[PDB]
Write a protein that binds this ligand. Structure first.
Ligand SMILES: C/C=C/C(=O)SCCNC(=O)CCNC(=O)[C@@H](O)C(C)(C)COP(=O)(O)OP(=O)(O)OC[C@H]1O[C@@H](n2cnc3c(N)ncnc32)[C@H](O)[C@@H]1OP(=O)(O)O
Ligand SMILES: C/C=C/C(=O)SCCNC(=O)CCNC(=O)[C@@H](O)C(C)(C)COP(=O)(O)OP(=O)(O)OC[C@H]1O[C@@H](n2cnc3c(N)ncnc32)[C@H](O)[C@@H]1OP(=O)(O)O
Ligand SMILES: C/C=C/C(=O)SCCNC(=O)CCNC(=O)[C@@H](O)C(C)(C)COP(=O)(O)OP(=O)(O)OC[C@H]1O[C@@H](n2cnc3c(N)ncnc32)[C@H](O)[C@@H]1OP(=O)(O)O
Ligand SMILES: [Cl-]
Ligand SMILES: [Cl-]
Ligand SMILES: [Cl-]
Lengths: 562, 558, 562
């Protein structure tokens, strides 16, 4: 039932059974993961109105609405801890990520109605753009579970104006619509002004019977007097159901309770165009042959230690199968085709450890795994270009310390080749996933399908072993202060300040808090995200290459045989 | 020598000669303007290495490089005071804006080498994106005068990572290239890592003979020892001319001094495709019939005072001519075609003052100028859609206090119609200029061709009479605290804080508006924008195939 | 003054000095060329009104207007002999091709006012579409020297209706405009209805003082009476200058005579955006090191004879330099980068002669040059894909007898690989030139950047040694009638009818008459056309790859060294 099994089935298998577990390493990784989960929990529960109080007066929390909406176990939260401005509640007042609904993947945004009635808080605008961007790049339906009181008044200057403030998503919703990507909103509670526009910008509007959307809402001693004297009229909240259902017909449908709204959304989701993924499969979905739990021993928290990348790839992709492009050329990178629930993806991943007698442009040299050289860069360039032609999404597994430096490296074209890769990625036009296994550092972070490719990277996730910095604090301390040491003790103070500050500001939690990485995910959650991404990417792709017309597999084969 | 003079020449003229100057108003506006210029000056001069010291060792400052590059008097700086993170030096370490080069408009980005050798500072990445974005939307060549030491080490966490950090411009440069928009870099001084990529991402590389671009540069007591012992070798800065000219050939050309580099850039700029603007003209360029200085009396700093928008439009556009679309329908807005150096633009501007017997969906009502109603919204929708079809760039003059509120307004479809306008703008696909005359407030700021339309708004500028807020502090204080003595404290805290954080300078510092420009600089920017937009447009509507003028005429006669 | 001389300058040189001329071969080719020129001459001079009579009453012929418009010696006519419907005059009543105007290449269409006042004749619509298509694909300004009386009344059914009839160009002109490509028209003489629309559809209208454009023009015994009684009024031809200049302002400018109109057009052409080609050069323009006249000896008219393709490539491209991609892999094809007036092009060309010990999927086999095999097809696929990424236009030199047949070939994926190439070409999105050196046959004609790629092939030209057929008449005779032999003299009659008919209908002149190839060009005109194409393609390209970000040269180098 599949094309070209000779190419796409029974690929080389990779990975060993884990013979030597590392409980202490596992304990270190799980400690990071636990801290993320506790922080996510503490953040979701924060706010003046609890889930309990919400339920008492007939409303569901953001997570209850999501869990009601999605197929159980398909929640891939993104930006859970995103809090670039340090809001007290620890979030941006939206919950967002990928969920599956009766088999259809959709991007989900839910207003956190526990916190200031879903108000726009600092950082929210940016958070929201990352949502509509992901949807845009994947051509994936965007679902708003809206309960939004608009601009948080004290912070208006940070949430109301500017190119990428609270007004932007409404343009982004129109762009999704114009690109042919539907937006569905469940309207809950009071949605004035900023909330109103969030209500009116989507394609389909499903309202709670008590909900409203409006250009403006109901919002010294006389001021208190006027309030009760203007409340005794029982004048209705502007733009309630009798207005936007009965008069304007802007609300297409109206339900009695939150779960009704969710059902309405489900119905409209069921209307949306989506391939049966079977159409794009080259194999029946198969689990990896090696357990993901091993990743807790395989990927070392001791950043000085290498590890075999193949052991990671064997645990993330179907059947631990892998079809490497140009094995032996560019030994610092692994580039090859794999399968995620039967679907083709291109994988690009750093190789760790020492590389004897390499790179070829240096005499008597040893290459450092995690670094990028001429062959690695050209190989990736070719591979990205091949995958682009073939409409094969790229998954980048980053663990990098940069492109090789020095005039020998410069003469090898390395700067040009790294940028050539950037060019290749931008030319690819396909949605891409970036997974930071450990190190995201140097310009290599950018060129390795980094999140700086705003047209291609849908989002990025990291494991608990991950860290982000320009370069290690010690290298940066030398780079920053060495010459000032020769100009002239307060300067060595500054150097230790720097080494410390680089450690502090490169910890997984901080990184995702600032959004350098969208989500820290458990080692056992990496594949689930890959699966969510790949299936979302193949749901309604905007371009097709028939398998028998794909070049990547052919060029791969030829490099093997010729 | 022009198509359809019956439509495009001798349009109705508008505006009166200013009979009653307002010296006190003028003084208030000019005070704001003076404070901007002084702040811009103080910011450009800040940094450890002065223009003087730069010149002594053979280098030009960012502004010297720009002024050498551009036709004199064509500098339209943007983001002069942009400093969202409050860097001490007051800037993002880049100077940027529109300049003209031998008649060709180009977007210019110059590294401020006065400050940490042009290092990436907090806010810079965002600043840079606004540059490549402007270029992208206008299909305008982007010029880098590069002197960039890469990531500022202490602030690496704010300048190195993330979707829109320092790595983003390199993708943006590839996108410009792939969209067919050339990037030209003059490479100066040391450009390692972050600087290297800024050097290598553009289309054309012109290098100073002492310059370098590299993946990585040269960058307890032993550390100082190793330095002098590693400096005695006189080992060359990685990726210098002998490497990137003589070996890789990545530097296409190499010059002896800064002005040589500038000449190289000029030569390559001269290679770039550009219409003679005469091609798109419907008239010979004419100054307005009324002086711009009048704007200092016309546009009131007293925000409670109205003014006649037509008096502004008469002073910004060629010959004070204006061809209004649907005059009398949607009286709260003026929408119509005008001319900027002979080129057609669509103008959309708020009308101020009371509007007797309006809106039509209310009994015995008076409409507030600066607000948006059913007819205004539909009219703008139609006008934007018409101009889009006709490939006519839109210039929005904002002075707004929002769309009308209340259930009567809701039944009039107002929410839907504001969003419909957002849809129309996004559908338009053309580059657009937004000018905040005074008030940028409410969702109206967004729908009136706001900078939130990231695919259409190239950038936005404001006059000294401008201010940005969700709503006035007093209205916000009621909205925030009404339902709730420490509470009246908070309300005055809010009214004050809204005043503080809505002043022109603050607004542009945060980048809510890209530049505060002098009243006499508004037209120059309009001229820069329009001419840049018509230089190499990606789409054409022949004048005789334009709908806007036809539909306009028909509304007048039928 | 150029990027990366190490890659782009001092490429390997190719080709030998011609030691053994072949005068008889030369004579055979030049005979074909002479017949083309005579036919083109006879066609241009045909019509009831001569150039002499035109000049007497103040008008220029199409060729006079073109020659006036263009830089001398830059005329590249296309479709000179295009006459699919066999019109008596031998043409489609338009003259078209590429001309250069003060350094700017433009596509030119001129109404043949010698023939029924520039009326729409059968085949014209198609001819016109090829013009707007070329302009569209190259993003090249389109110039109309219009003198058009609209639909030829007796042939209205063939020139007026249908998806690709006389109304289509007006839509095509709007599409060019919407794509950002300007159309300039010089309006001459009477242009009613069909002519009117041709006048009004362009961007810029320059009128002759006596010209008109109109929805409708002035057009038993009483009918003759009404004519003189309706002519005595001296009622002006509808839509003359007083109307379309003085009233509507549709004519932007008006000139006294034909050369004035041409000067108007020149002025507006001077307004058009165009790179100085220096911007895209990687070298200073250099002539080939070997003379093109040699082509008359090199390319054999005896179709059974091979020849060295390198000798052709050495004579068509700058300095006889060539940078071959994957030399030794896919030995049946040459694919590599070359220079045309300093500008990078990708060249793909058939290798002729026997290929010992090939293809690799057959035991004890000899490959036929001119045929396509696994490595050739994969190589081309890669090369096209590489050049697409790099924004390097492709020039295909076709001399082909098809992809290899048989189940061995089928197992080698040949069908899929040929179609993969079609996919690659369509993915390339760049303008492409196709030159038929000799044989355009089999599906190979299609996959080798054939004119069937309506989004990529701007047009196609052929030498006098060229010929087009599905397969040779003798092979086709067997294929058609062999089985009808076994089933059963009238059948061998039919076989000779076929062999003859295939010869007749595959001669260069017939081929271009039908438009299978757009123009038969002299051996010494091939490079000029390449030069016209390349410079037009680089004039205002819609996409750029910076040289230091180009992959083709890097991947080429690596295949050479690794
Ligand atoms: C261009 C766009 C501009 C804008 O968006 S302008 C902002 C317009 N927004 C409003 O008018 C909202 C006024 N709010 C209500 O009516 C809000 O009670 C509401 C009607 C929702 C919600 O009222 P509830 O009775 O349902 O109370 P909740 O538990 O859901 O939350 C209310 C609580 O959250 C906080 N809250 C709610 N909205 C905001 C905001 N916006 N900012 C800061 N804090 C907020 C505040 O502590 C509120 O207390 P009160 O003021 O006493 O009601
Ligand atoms: C992904 C990309 C990552 C990156 O970009 S990593 C950053 C790589 N950058 C470097 O290695 C630059 C090291 N700098 C030099 O060699 C720099 O002297 C330099 C070679 C330029 C410039 O040296 P000059 O001798 O020309 O001195 P300048 O007046 O131009 O400015 C130097 C001065 O500016 C400041 N400066 C310069 N660069 C930086 C930076 N980057 N951060 C903070 N502050 C800086 C600093 O006070 C410097 O003093 P010293 O350290 O004593 O030289
Ligand atoms: C959807 C679009 C539909 C259409 O285009 S409908 C066609 C509308 N066309 C007309 O009405 C053209 C009528 N022609 C004139 O007025 C034409 O004399 C004319 C005004 C040009 C040209 O008249 P001239 O006096 O300049 O004579 P010319 O030497 O340029 O050529 C005229 C000659 O060409 C021939 N001719 C010209 N036009 C046509 C056409 N169209 N078909 C066939 N043959 C034609 C014919 O033999 C003509 O002889 P007359 O009929 O005695 O004038
Ligand atoms: Cl790097
Ligand atoms: Cl509003
Ligand atoms: Cl074939």
């Amino acid at each position: 039932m599949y094309s070209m099994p000779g190419y796409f089935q029974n690929m080389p298998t990779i990975g060993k059974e884990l013979v030597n577990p590392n409980p202490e390493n596992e304990q270190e990784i799980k400690a990071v993961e636990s801290d993320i989960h506790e922080s996510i929990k503490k953040a979701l529960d924060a706010g003046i109105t609890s889930e309990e109080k919400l339920n008492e007066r007939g409303q569901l929390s953001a997570m209850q609405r999501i869990n009601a909406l999605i197929d159980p176990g398909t929640w891939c939260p993104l930006n859970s801890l995103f809090n670039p401005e340090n809001n007290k509640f620890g979030t941006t007042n939206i919950v967002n990520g990928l969920g599956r609904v009766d088999g259809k993947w959709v991007y989900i945004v839910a207003s956190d109605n526990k916190k200031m009635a879903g108000a726009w808080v600092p950082g929210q605008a940016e958070n929201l753009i990352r949502c509509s961007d992901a949807a845009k790049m994947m051509h994936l339906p965007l679902i708003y579970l809206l309960n939004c009181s608009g601009v948080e008044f004290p912070n208006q200057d940070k949430v109301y104006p500017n190119r990428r403030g609270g007004g932007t998503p409404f343009f982004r919703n129109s762009e999704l619509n114009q690109l042919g990507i539907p937006v569905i909103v469940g309207i809950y509670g009071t949605n004035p002004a900023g909330g109103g526009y969030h209500s009116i910008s989507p394609t389909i509007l499903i309202a709670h019977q008590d909900a409203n959307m409006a250009v403006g809402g109901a919002g010294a001693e006389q001021i208190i007097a006027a309030q009760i004297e203007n409340s005794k009229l029982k004048v209705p909240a502007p733009g309630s159901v009798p207005i936007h259902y009965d008069e304007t017909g802007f609300f297409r449908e109206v339900y009695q309770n939150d779960l009704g709204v969710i059902d309405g959304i489900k119905k409209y989701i069921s209307y949306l165009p989506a391939y049966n993924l079977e159409f794009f499969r080259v194999d029946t979905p198969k689990a990896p042959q090696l357990p993901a739990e091993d990743l807790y021993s395989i990927i070392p928290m001791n950043q000085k230690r290498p590890y075999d990348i193949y052991e990671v790839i064997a645990r993330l992709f179907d059947n631990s199968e892998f079809s490497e492009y140009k094995k032996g050329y560019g030994p610092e990178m692994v580039t090859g085709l794999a399968k995620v629930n039967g679907l083709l993806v291109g994988v690009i991943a750093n190789v760790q450890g020492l590389l004897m007698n390499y790179p070829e442009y240096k005499q008597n040299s040893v290459g450092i795994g995690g670094k990028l050289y001429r062959q690695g860069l050209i190989k990736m360039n070719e591979f990205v270009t091949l995958c682009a032609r073939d409409r094969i999404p790229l998954i980048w597994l980053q663990d990098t310390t940069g492109i090789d430096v020095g005039d020998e490296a410069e003469k090898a074209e390395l700067l040009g080749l790294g940028q050539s890769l950037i060019y290749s990625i931008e030319n690819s036009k396909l949605p891409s996933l970036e997974i930071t296994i450990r190190k995201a550092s140097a310009a290599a972070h950018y060129v390795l399908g980094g999140p700086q490719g705003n047209n291609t990277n849908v989002f990025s996730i990291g494991t608990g072993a991950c860290e982000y910095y320009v370069m290690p604090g010690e290298t940066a301390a030398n780079a920053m202060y060495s010459r000032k040491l020769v100009k002239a003790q307060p300067i060595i103070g500054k150097m230790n300040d720097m080494i410390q500050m680089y450690t502090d500001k490169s910890r997984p939690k901080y990184c995702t808090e600032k959004g350098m990485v969208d989500e820290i995910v458990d080692m056992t959650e990496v594949r689930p995200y890959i699966q969510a991404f790949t299936e979302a990417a193949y749901q309604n792709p905007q371009s097709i290459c028939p398998m028998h017309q794909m070049l990547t597999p052919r060029s791969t084969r030829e490099f093997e045989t010729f």
